[PDB]
Design an enzyme around this catalytic site. Sequence first.
Site, short mmCIF file in Angstrom:
data_model
loop_
_atom_site.label_atom_id
_atom_site.label_comp_id
_atom_site.label_asym_id
_atom_site.label_seq_id
_atom_site.Cartn_x
_atom_site.Cartn_y
_atom_site.Cartn_z
N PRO A 1 0.82 -1.23 0.00
CA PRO A 1 0.00 0.00 0.00
C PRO A 1 0.85 1.27 0.00
CG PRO A 1 0.03 -1.03 2.19
CD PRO A 1 1.10 -1.70 1.37
N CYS A 2 1.51 1.52 -1.12
CA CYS A 2 2.37 2.69 -1.30
C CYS A 2 1.67 3.65 -2.27
CB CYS A 2 3.75 2.29 -1.80
SG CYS A 2 3.75 1.12 -3.18
N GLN A 3 0.91 4.59 -1.71
CA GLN A 3 0.17 5.56 -2.51
C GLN A 3 0.37 6.94 -1.89
#
Length: 1020
Positions: A698-700
């Site tokens: 979850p790299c946003q």
Amino acid sequence: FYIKINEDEIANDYPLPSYYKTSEEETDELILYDASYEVQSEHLPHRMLHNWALYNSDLRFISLELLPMKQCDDIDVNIFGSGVVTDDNGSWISLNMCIFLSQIKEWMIEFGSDDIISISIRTDVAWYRLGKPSKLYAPWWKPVLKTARVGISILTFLRRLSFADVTKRLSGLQANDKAYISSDPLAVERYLVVHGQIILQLFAVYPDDNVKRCPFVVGLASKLEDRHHTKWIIKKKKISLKELNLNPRAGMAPVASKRKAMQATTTRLVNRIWGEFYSNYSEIKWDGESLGKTSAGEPLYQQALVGGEMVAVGGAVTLEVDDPDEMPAIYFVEYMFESTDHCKMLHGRFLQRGSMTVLGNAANERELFLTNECMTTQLKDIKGVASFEIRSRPWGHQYRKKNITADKLDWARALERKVKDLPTEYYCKSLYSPERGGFFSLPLSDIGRSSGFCTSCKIREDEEKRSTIKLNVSKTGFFINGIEYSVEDFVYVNPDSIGSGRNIGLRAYVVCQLLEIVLGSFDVKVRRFYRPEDVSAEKAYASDIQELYFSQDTVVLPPGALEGKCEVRKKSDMPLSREYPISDHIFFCDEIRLATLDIFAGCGGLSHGLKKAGVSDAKWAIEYEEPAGQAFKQNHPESTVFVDNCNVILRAIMEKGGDQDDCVSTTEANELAAKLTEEQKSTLPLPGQVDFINGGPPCQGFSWSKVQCEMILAFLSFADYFRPRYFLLENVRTFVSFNKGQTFQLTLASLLEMGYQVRFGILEAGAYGVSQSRKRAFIWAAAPEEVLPEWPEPMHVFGVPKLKISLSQGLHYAAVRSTALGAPFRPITVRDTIGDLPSVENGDSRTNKEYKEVAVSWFQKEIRGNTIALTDHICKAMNELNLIRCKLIPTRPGADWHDLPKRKVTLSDGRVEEMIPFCLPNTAERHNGWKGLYGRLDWQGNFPTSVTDPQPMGKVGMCFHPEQHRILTVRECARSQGFPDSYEFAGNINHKHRQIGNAVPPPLAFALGRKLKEALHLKK
Ligand SMILES: Nc1ncnc2c1ncn2[C@@H]1O[C@H](CSCC[C@H](N)C(=O)O)[C@@H](O)[C@H]1O
Ligand SMILES: [Zn+2]
């Protein structure tokens, strides 16, 4: 009488609407105070309030000017507030326990020295002196001070005049002054008349009496009547404290907030790569005898001496090109011969530098890449030779340490070779292909044969032969685009070539049957088939996806109107395996499974699809939250799901593996890992037992101290440690554009450094069967001895342009073709997905129900199956105002809040509120009129982007059922993603909605797994 100005008049001077948020619980105001008998307006206690924030019932920030400045009884507008209450103490403003209040009644301003003002708020209970405001409420406080400035200055000028004179004298002052307003007299007049109450009270509170009788105040009071306002009455009654708190958050338990992020635990390689990047960037003769002759008879040699340097097949030569500041090109020679003109020819393949590839600045300096392009030149003149070698190392997790120990040594040499000013020795490990977009494996057997045959040259010659239409010898077929067309075939024709609402009005491929043939000086005559959509929408709704009709229409077309070949079968013999999504171009008319490891598992849509494919079985899992882990355990019982934080599971695995010196971790990670019991420690997998790793971190978001908690470094570390035969990465569409695409380049560089063959692509799920627009970025990685899977072919027409990843030097790559022009199958609308579900009311909570209507559409048939237990058909709840607003929106497509009538509604609780949810500023930059909010859906449209939390409070978007006055349920959101009806979810409604929102559509995973199975069946 009191004149109160409407908010629309002053909306031009206030920012766009925003809503109040908090994370700490508060106490009721009435509890603290006694609420005694009726007292005068002075007897109430005086205290101060800090960190104040004012809002209406919808928790939307409101201005102080909406509050009457005198005593009135029939207050038509209710404003609530929050802050912290402290004991009163004298503190002025000149120029620079939590508690939520009850209904606010009045506000009062008092003047002090030449630049001293004070404001205070009176409720039914006590007074409150005003202090510093919240950071979010600051923009709503600036105008109130600003108008005060406008007052103060003009007072200094009053020490007998008309109204226009002061306006024109104020319009002339320069913009640098703190009291500047506008140069246009109309603007200054409008602003002066729209904020007249504040300066009127300021004039009326001045100690001097002469200023009170100036014609300015009476003129402004007279002119306040014309424009939009409301009128109240003034009285001096004794206030009664007998009331109940009416704040909208009387209950409203605080929402969970402030989930802190900590540094990721990684291995040495990935941390080293990312930290290293971010720390610095944020006489010619022959040799030997002949070996043979070419096709034309030219003898070929293998070794030459040029200017004292040695040239041989397998080496590298350098040429000369313009722009001398650029470095010379490198060519890997293949064969060198002598022509009939007694000249020395040579053939070479261009070796591209890393910096000109997709990796950009993250590429290795010493690594060259083989290219498809090649050229021939003369051996007579070549700048020189260059050191070059092809690198090939054994694959496996047992060589990893060795593969590391050499590398530093190699780099050491490079460092020395840079210190001593020596030419750099390059190397090549893979084959760069921008036309396919990936770094594939080197065909070692087809390079450097010294035979006169070049594979790349033959491929280019065949491609040139392709796309050139030529007739066949039998005058019954031809060869176009690599396809051998013949008589009695079925072909695809573009719809144009035959004489939300994104996909509304979009057609699909027209299937025709070749009748006969009437360079390329000929045309084709074909028959015609029809589709159920060509009759009516109802016919297309309740008909099979592959159904077709026959017609005797015949038409003639040029050969360029054909897009491919399809098969038409009788309605008696099918493949008997109703796979979904369909991958075979067929219409009708009338021992390899690998142990995997899922990271960031979630509910498990991707794992479900991969297992359905037949190339995976979830033997291990990692998750973070309890409901998601429970759901994954429920759906896949055989999997050993780990719920503890993933960033420490890696530490536990490394400690079990006895390599604790090769894993950087925080102090807390060791303590958390040590707390694990014996069974879970014994259940941990070990290297060599895992042959597949998939998941999406979850790299946003949009520097080294911040990019060390991206959660993708841990994924790369897992891949590096386990070294599976296959690797899959998935993320959002914008993943290739974060920080100018630095993270994507870094991930590619790390994957290449480990040794995999990688390929990237942006895929739209709507073309593969789902009814929701969702674009995701995928990365495939495979071992050198295996075959990288091919991208699946979309089969549904969906209107979206080609999603291209931008390479370097003005190059774009599209993984799959755009399906808007045509496709074998039509898209899936809203009614085809959730049409058959029974109707529910607002705020339903029954988890288990029974199905009422049989499936009609193909999607409903394929997604229901045989389960007879309806699960999670529940929706959130609306209050009175939100439900009333929802009931007033018509059922037409494209409806939004613009259709809400302008009026005020009195609720059963005893409050009067405006129906219109927002008050946008006129002549401002409000895009498209803020459309889409409070919006219904369309039966024949497509679902919008799935929100992880469709909230029925504040700025609620397009999340309404097309017919029923409610929000979409959990089961409908799951169905829109292709989830089978037998899937299980865990947690409360918010957790289930979040689980469905983050999930990947199972059909896309099934297509990827099918392609992986096809690749696996070809390694032999
Ligand atoms: N540090 C962490 N460790 C483990 N899981 C995490 C995590 N941070 C986020 N997650 C979880 O990882 C998921 C991200 S979305 C992944 C969805 C999954 N690929 C699917 O197809 O269903 C969420 O469930 C989130 O709660
Ligand atoms: Zn060639």
